[PDB]
Write a protein that binds this ligand. Sequence first.
Ligand SMILES: COC(=O)c1nc(=O)[nH]c2ccccc12
Length: 160
Amino acid sequence: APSYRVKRMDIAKNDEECVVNAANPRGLPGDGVCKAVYKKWPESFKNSATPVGTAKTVMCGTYPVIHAVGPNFSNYSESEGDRELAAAYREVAKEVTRLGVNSVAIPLLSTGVYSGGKDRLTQSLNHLFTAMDSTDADVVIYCRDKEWEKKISEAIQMRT
Ligand SMILES: COC(=O)c1nc(=O)[nH]c2ccccc12
């Protein structure tokens, strides 16, 4: 029976069969979540470029890294950002399904330096659920904040 779970830890130390990188559309290393991911799976950055609202898988040995590009809300309108954020999660669901994995480690896309300085915990998490509800993978959501951990945990709890 597939679960959602949340872990307050470095996604680069995930115990899942594949990882989602919070990527830039240029396929560049970056800083934060992308940094740790670059350090752990640097070969996965070969031709990792993919447009905003898309996801592209690059293998690191046999370990899949799914580079998912949420929108930078600084650059987008609220309505266009929302569309691109939903689309990115949909493409994650497709790659997870295509790869046949039993589990996936996923961050909340567009909630850090791409948030346009807004709290998008609820917006981003609900787009993740919409996409991942049609898959059979165990989903483990990674965050850093102690609060976010609690709010994500409660939103998981009150669907079950
Ligand atoms: C995960 O939190 C973010 O703000 C974020 N989301 C992305 O979808 N791509 C990124 C790329 C570089 C930096 C941050 C991001």
